[PDB]
Symmetry: D3
Subunit: 133 residues, 6 copies
Amino acid sequence: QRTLVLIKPDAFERSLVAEIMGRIEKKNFKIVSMKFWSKAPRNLIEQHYKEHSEQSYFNDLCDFMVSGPIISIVYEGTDAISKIRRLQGNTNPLASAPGTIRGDLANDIGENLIHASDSEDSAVDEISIWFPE
Amino acid sequence: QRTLVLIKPDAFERSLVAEIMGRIEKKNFKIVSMKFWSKAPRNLIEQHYKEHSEQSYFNDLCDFMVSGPIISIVYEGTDAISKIRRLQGNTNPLASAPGTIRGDLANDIGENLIHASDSEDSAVDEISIWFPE
Amino acid sequence: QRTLVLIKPDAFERSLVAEIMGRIEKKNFKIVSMKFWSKAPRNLIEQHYKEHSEQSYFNDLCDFMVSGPIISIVYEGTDAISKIRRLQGNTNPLASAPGTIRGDLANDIGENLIHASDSEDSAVDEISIWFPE
Amino acid sequence: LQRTLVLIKPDAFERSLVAEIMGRIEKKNFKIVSMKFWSKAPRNLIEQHYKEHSEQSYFNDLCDFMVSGPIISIVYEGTDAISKIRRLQGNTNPLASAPGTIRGDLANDIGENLIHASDSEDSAVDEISIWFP
Amino acid sequence: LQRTLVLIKPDAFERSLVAEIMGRIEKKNFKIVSMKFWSKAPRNLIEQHYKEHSEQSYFNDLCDFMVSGPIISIVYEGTDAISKIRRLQGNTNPLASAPGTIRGDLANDIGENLIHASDSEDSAVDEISIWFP
Amino acid sequence: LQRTLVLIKPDAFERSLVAEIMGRIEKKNFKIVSMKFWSKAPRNLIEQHYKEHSEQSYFNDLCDFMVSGPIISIVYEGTDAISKIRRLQGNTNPLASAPGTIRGDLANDIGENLIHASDSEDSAVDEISIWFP
Ligand SMILES: Nc1ccn([C@@H]2O[C@H](COP(=O)(O)OP(=O)(O)O)[C@@H](O)[C@H]2O)c(=O)n1
Ligand SMILES: Nc1ccn([C@@H]2O[C@H](COP(=O)(O)OP(=O)(O)O)[C@@H](O)[C@H]2O)c(=O)n1
Ligand SMILES: Nc1ccn([C@@H]2O[C@H](COP(=O)(O)OP(=O)(O)O)[C@@H](O)[C@H]2O)c(=O)n1
Ligand SMILES: Nc1ccn([C@@H]2O[C@H](COP(=O)(O)OP(=O)(O)O)[C@@H](O)[C@H]2O)c(=O)n1
Ligand SMILES: Nc1ccn([C@@H]2O[C@H](COP(=O)(O)OP(=O)(O)O)[C@@H](O)[C@H]2O)c(=O)n1
Ligand SMILES: Nc1ccn([C@@H]2O[C@H](COP(=O)(O)OP(=O)(O)O)[C@@H](O)[C@H]2O)c(=O)n1
Ligand SMILES: [Mg+2]
Ligand SMILES: [Mg+2]
Ligand SMILES: [Mg+2]
Ligand SMILES: [Mg+2]
Ligand SMILES: [Mg+2]
Ligand SMILES: [Mg+2]
């Protein structure tokens, strides 16, 4: 499987980019594609998060995602989608488990360091958004 | 919220002080106050652990807590009390989860490296004990 | 208690030997005996895994275990058997928890870095296999 | 303020040291301003990158190595980035690279040495225009 | 056996490197004998600390920086603590600090350089009496 | 390609630095070819190991220290293993061992200095035949 991961602007701000990538790297997942964005276009962000367009946090979320750089990465591995989701940790700081990326490093439900596709369907979708080629 | 954390004498003995503080630091909690005690007065210890005065381990616990230095720290952050408790890990070595401080580092129910307040009520209480000002 | 741990050939291949040993070392378990095997004899491997002789993976498993070096280690500590099992993590990569050795480092149900005895009975047994003296 | 061109070499991918190397540069507070992942760099880019070495005995082996796995090309930005990152990198020769340097700690071969860093202002501008034209 | 005075500078807090720096000194087996957290050090303590620099061009900027965030003052104890910790610290100038040193690995500015360490026996005694009178 | 003899000294066990030290050599890509755990090395092996020092003032204290806890004897293999691992090791004198070296980062005593490494081809062959006859 291939999954789409984003390193979010807060990781750059907090100098955690290598930390997060290294956790996935140490689990033996392989980078298939990678793009550095000094600032992602808002439209890309809005597409990526289209399922959230009616949520009260939608605009703050979009602002945050264009507030700094992003790295988009396609990772490949057996069951990569579910596995990276478990490494990522829960969105909520009251739930993300110590040992996960978010459990160890993130303290906010919004600024939470990392995106990972949550299903095969959304992976295909998100990979096409960030890597249309 | 603010929570009271103690680095216990075993952390000093095992050179784990930075390791433990760094875990909390990496989760983005801010130090509000901090005190180094070369040896905490026994009365302080007894006050801190007053709810345990009738337990069979009470005296050994007090002896341990004055057996070496302690750092008392007030940490501040959203939901800091519950969050630091989860990072800390369960008291019992048969239960504390890998990824938590105790799960990774502690092997004894007594010498377990770190105290953290378990509720808002006890936080206020413990902060007043270690930082009466 | 004493438990038998094997560092498997994949750990050597991936340069993870110190990483894994260090996790157990940091939990304060003591090495009682240790043997380095440039290649374990197949018969030893087959004895170690005798309960799996009827599984479809038995032969591939034996081939893997002689494909590179192994370190056998006897660790000692209170409840060392169950504790090291929890640090190890589940066999299945879909289940092993971030924070465990396998959850963090292993991505395959076969090549999973580390063996640890699962009970007192099997510990005694496995210790006698690797350390017959 | 300067920009320098870094390549993460194919041995870094093979040995799972990508984040380790990027992390050392990150902790030194250098900022990524461009980055491209190459599953396999074109021979000609490599030969152009090392055009100074084209008549050297090791040229063909060097170019072969450089196309034997993925690379990442990165432009780093910071005050005196060029000399400072050269210092982090360490000497080409494993007999001379100091512990604490990337190569001193991690590399054990004069050829397979994990990282390229531009060695001057002029070469930085040249290399940057090769990888990011 | 000697005592030396270390300050963790405000940039360390900003960049979440407090435990990282303390940890390097801890792993070298130096013992904390005094420690005080300052949410903001008094200007006058800072000016007294750096009184030697009072006529230097950078004095006002230095003092401003030093009161721009928290600091920790620490007295470390050990055999030849003064010269040894100075060695860990690394050169003031980022063009000269060796990789493997605190500043060589972590600092990228001559001013914002993370840590102060007493540079001699006499200055150690002076500085210790400033921060711990 | 060379082989060198390393001893992990009893202070490494006491301070839980076994994996830390082995890990530095591992990351440098040196391969273990022999390894033996000694819960307590025989006095005579130690005295033979250091026979060059037999008339030195520190000999008895050195031998006493060396039998005061476990040691691991390891034969490492790699290109120029002898000089390269000596470089990792760092100077005997804590006034001289460079940060980034094993001793520079970790050791704070001329006697208790964590690791032995053969210092030449001839001494490597001698020491290897002592520990692995
Ligand atoms: N209550 C919420 C939920 C999500 N969000 C943001 O929206 C993104 C997550 O929506 P999601 O439910 O798909 O969460 P993840 O898959 O990112 O865990 C998060 O990563 C947050 O940045 C938020 O700011 N507040
Ligand atoms: N069975 C027990 C329970 C607690 N204790 C000690 O008493 C303190 C804990 O009591 P507690 O139930 O408040 O535990 P924590 O909040 O520290 O996890 C522990 O940190 C131990 O040092 C003990 O020695 N034996
Ligand atoms: N479905 C399976 C189950 C086990 N195995 C192998 O057989 C060994 C495990 O059998 P086990 O159930 O005793 O697992 P652990 O105790 O090693 O977790 C594993 O470590 C794998 O190397 C496998 O290759 N495929
Ligand atoms: N004697 C040599 C010199 C360089 N080389 C290789 O080709 C590159 C030589 O470039 P260089 O001399 O500019 O060394 P660096 O600047 O990469 O340290 C090195 O990175 C090695 O990969 C080699 O294989 N043998
Ligand atoms: N040229 C300089 C020299 C020092 N400084 C600052 O003021 C302090 C100078 O003290 P120093 O020369 O005793 O340097 P260290 O002993 O801190 O390495 C440094 O830590 C810098 O923060 C500066 O900003 N510019
Ligand atoms: N002045 C000295 C020199 C060495 N020694 C000890 O004995 C060994 C001396 O051997 P050496 O001079 O060959 O030093 P290394 O090669 O171990 O760095 C050291 O590892 C110290 O443990 C000492 O205690 N005092
Ligand atoms: Mg989602
Ligand atoms: Mg409690
Ligand atoms: Mg089993
Ligand atoms: Mg060059
Ligand atoms: Mg100074
Ligand atoms: Mg010697």
